[PDB]
User: Which sequence fits this backbone?
């Protein structure tokens, strides 16, 4: 239980933690020369203040990178500010690179992996000189941390003091007219989603774009609805510490449960809204598998008269890394299965494994740029997947 | 993956959860079934709490989720004796079925959770979801969330209040302790609390006694620091959250070097002076005698985490099956368990255990 102990160590020491899932580009999976692990600009001024300027092209500094997740020698990694936008070119991003040969952070097969970089604050206002990292090597490890703090979505850039980041509940509340009744009752996930779609996006008739915009709106109104209801109880206080913790746990489970059901609820709504009215979500196939989405219906799937080559299923895996093979056993009849994912890319080798198993990836349009070229070319946008189905069942 | 999703499923579906580590008696390594406070069973099956007849009972479906076993039918029975000439008056659950993870002596010391599905109307529980951790990897998942589960500890209540990521506890605060005045403003370190407990309020009884004093002091200190704030209320979600996370993290950290410290004091105090806590948590007679010896490792829970030591073993586990011990008797593992705990081990390994006293006595010299 090394990871567990590592988490306990970090959570109570002076560390500034940054959590993210490795993108195809982070690992060099998108090909070419390694550019490094992306770091949020809003974190550079705190950790590497000396490279946060445009006086010279590509300023950088070194820091010792200790990897606790894999048996790797410590190395002098390089935090760097790709500055060329201020020197006649185009770059404008900060990254940490040169992890050393064989390092998990430079391994394309770790694309999609949940990674935690615990930076040691410099007691002098200077640049951070050491980072302790953990690249989750399996789903078992990821379950350890995500069970407590929640699942980390691809693209998420989480950072803050270790204690608050690893505590269980996530801080941060910044960004509407909520219906009267929401001030009295706590709306369901579907209700929030139907309100987000029906009341705020509408600036895009494209499914891929609608999904991303509505996901952003859902996040904000849930936060507002949550704030209303929680602020009320919270203001009255509690009789004991454990009545206090019990509520925190209640609040935490609600967020986790809703975060987990969100994506599938949005897709269900979009399929309906775009004319694709032929599909089952609570549909059993063989034994007790039940794929996330089955087209055109549970009935047609079990129908001896209905053509098999016209059946389709769509498994939804926010993060598909090591969480996709369990889909090949969900529909005996369907040999070409579709997988919807929000992952910021997959390696060529990962994709080859998928291709060989008859898996076809459906990815939100704007996320395609995150995939290696060879893989990108075979991706399906959400809009195209909907179109393909909205034709096969035209009758 | 499945456990990860199971936990969230249970947390949000009207369940009552009961968590504890399986003792030797719960498993049978010494088949009645896991111990469950009669009080809890009584609330879970209110229809059996009568004396209209002897040992009245009801069946409930036992679904095993941690393993692939078929839905057996267990029963909640109110042992009524006392009201029929004898002396039994306690509600229990039995017949978990044979071949069930709960009735497997090899799962001794394993963390287990029982999720009883509740009826919002008020009727008897008719279903119980079972999860017996089959690896430390699974135990890490749940313990990272609720905190380390000490052998003998019992955790239960609404699943959505227990699970979720923050560490809840159920013991009441003991205000009978007089503490240093600065501790109201400065939270003392674990060691500071243990040293205090070792200087104020057979070592076999002491360790386990300072162990409880330390826990009470920590809880009292915690109350002095946050109760008043908590009673006042919060002005924002994030202030509530920031304190919840901090309160919880400090709790989860407590179960770090508690045992390796309480023992240390009990040694210096009982002759055993010079020793080493690093070259290996312990060493006898000293680090110098390492350049022919006794190396004692400490593990609150022994199951699946002793092998690394092979390159004496003090534990607080409520028993170890016959087979489990064999593998340990070999390799070179000599157990050390507090007297009050031997009665927990198999009616065979018991007489082979070396109490904390018998250990201190021997090493002395």
Assistant:
């Amino acid at each position: 239980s090394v990871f567990h102990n590592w988490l306990l160590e970090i959570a109570c020491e002076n560390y500034f933690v940054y959590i993210k899932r490795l993108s195809a580009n982070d690992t060099g999976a998108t090909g070419g020369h390694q550019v490094g692990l992306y770091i949020p600009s809003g974190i550079v001024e705190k950790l590497f203040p000396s490279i946060n300027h445009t006086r010279e092209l590509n300023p950088s500094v070194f820091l010792t990178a200790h990897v606790s997740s894999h048996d790797c020698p410590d190395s002098e990694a390089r935090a760097i500010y790709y500055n060329s936008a201020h020197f006649g070119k185009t770059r404008n991003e900060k990254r940490i690179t040169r992890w050393g040969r064989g390092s998990p952070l430079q391994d394309p097969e770790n694309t999609g992996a949940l990674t935690l970089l615990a930076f040691k604050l410099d007691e002098q206002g200077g640049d951070c000189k050491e980072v302790n990292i953990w690249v989750c090597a399996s789903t078992d490890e990821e379950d350890v941390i995500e069970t407590a703090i929640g699942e980390v979505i691809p693209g998420a850039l989480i950072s803050g003091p270790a204690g608050q980041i690893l505590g269980g509940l996530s801080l941060q509340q910044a960004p509407y007219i909520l219906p009267e009744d929401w001030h009295l009752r706590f709306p369901s996930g579907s209700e929030i989603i139907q309100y987000a779609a029906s009341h705020y996006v509408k600036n895009s008739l494209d499914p891929d774009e609608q999904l991303l915009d509505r996901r952003r709106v859902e996040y904000d109104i849930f936060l507002l609805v949550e704030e209303l209801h929680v602020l009320d109880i919270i203001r009255k206080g509690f009789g004991s510490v454990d009545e206090f913790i019990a509520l925190a746990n209640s609040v935490s489970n609600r967020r986790k449960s809703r975060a987990g059901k969100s994506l599938e609820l949005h897709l269900e709504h979009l399929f309906i809204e775009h004319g694709l009215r032929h599909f089952a979500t609570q549909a059993i196939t063989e034994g007790n598998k039940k794929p996330d989405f089955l087209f055109p219906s549970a009935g047609a799937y079990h129908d001896t008269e209905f053509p098999v080559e016209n059946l389709r299923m769509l498994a939804v895996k926010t993060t598909c890394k090591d969480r996709w093979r369990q889909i090949l056993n969900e529909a005996d009849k369907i040999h070409q299965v579709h997988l919807f994912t929000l992952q910021e890319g997959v390696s060529l080798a990962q994709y080859r494994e998928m291709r060989e198993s008859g898996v076809r990836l459906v990815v939100p349009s704007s996320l395609h740029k995150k995939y290696p070229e060879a893989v990108r070319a075979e991706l399906m946008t959400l809009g195209a997947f909907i179109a393909e189905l909205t034709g096969l069942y035209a009758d």
In short: The longest strand of chain A covers residues 60-67. Chain A has two domains: 1-174, 175-395. The first helix of chain A runs from residue 2 to 11. Residues 130 and 299 of chain A are 59 Å apart (CA to CA).
